[PDB]
């Protein structure tokens, strides 16, 4: 599995693999933004941002939001497109309902090495 839940509360903030912190773009929560906090790197490292789907085909397979890298250490950044047919914004089929009613939905995201 290995996914981190990132909740659709505008002030939510998580960390993936101890490498990248995540926040929302704005109160509309249309996309996550990323910042590298994984230490200084002798060479730039790249990771693919995997996101789960909650509905539709192949629920067992991750999609990608794009890539992040260790040069994203000074400014929050959007994931860099693959794209190709890659989703820029959060849609219903990324959203999982809270385990307890009355509380925000979440998306499931994680990093894998870009290879
Ligand atoms: Co990938």
């Amino acid at each position: 599995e290995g996914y981190t839940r990132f909740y659709r509360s505008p002030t939510a903030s998580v960390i993936l693999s101890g490498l990248v912190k995540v926040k929302w773009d704005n109160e509309q929560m249309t996309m996550p933004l990323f910042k590298w906090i994984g230490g200084e790197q002798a060479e730039e490292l790249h990771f693919c941002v995997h996101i789960a789907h909650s509905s539709g085909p192949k629920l067992n397979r991750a999609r990608s939001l794009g890539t992040v890298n260790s040069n994203m250490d000074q400014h929050w950044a959007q994931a860099q497109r693959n794209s190709g047919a890659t989703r820029r914004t959060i849609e219903g089929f990324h959203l999982f309902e809270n385990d307890i009613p009355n509380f925000p939905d979440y998306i499931k995201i994680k990093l894998v090495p870009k290879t």
Side-chain angles (χ1 to χ4, degrees), residues 20 22 27 86:
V20 176
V22 192
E27 80 143 36
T86 212

Short mmCIF file of all heavy atoms in Angstrom, two decimals, residues 20 22 27 86:
data_model
loop_
_atom_site.label_atom_id
_atom_site.label_comp_id
_atom_site.label_asym_id
_atom_site.label_seq_id
_atom_site.Cartn_x
_atom_site.Cartn_y
_atom_site.Cartn_z
N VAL A 20 9.33 14.89 1.23
CA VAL A 20 8.60 15.97 0.61
C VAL A 20 7.41 16.32 1.47
O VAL A 20 6.63 15.43 1.83
CB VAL A 20 8.13 15.51 -0.80
CG1 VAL A 20 7.28 16.57 -1.49
CG2 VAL A 20 9.33 15.20 -1.69
N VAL A 22 3.79 18.39 1.88
CA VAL A 22 2.66 18.62 0.99
C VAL A 22 1.66 19.56 1.64
O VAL A 22 1.37 19.39 2.83
CB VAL A 22 1.93 17.28 0.64
CG1 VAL A 22 0.95 17.47 -0.52
CG2 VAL A 22 2.93 16.19 0.30
N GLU A 27 -7.82 27.37 -0.75
CA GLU A 27 -8.99 26.84 -0.07
C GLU A 27 -9.88 25.98 -0.95
O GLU A 27 -10.63 25.19 -0.48
CB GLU A 27 -9.80 27.95 0.63
CG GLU A 27 -10.69 28.73 -0.27
CD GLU A 27 -12.03 29.13 0.37
OE1 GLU A 27 -11.99 29.42 1.56
OE2 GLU A 27 -13.06 29.14 -0.33
N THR A 86 -2.15 13.16 -17.96
CA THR A 86 -1.98 13.14 -16.51
C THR A 86 -2.83 14.21 -15.84
O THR A 86 -2.92 15.34 -16.32
CB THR A 86 -0.51 13.33 -16.11
OG1 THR A 86 -0.24 12.60 -14.91
CG2 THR A 86 -0.21 14.80 -15.88
#
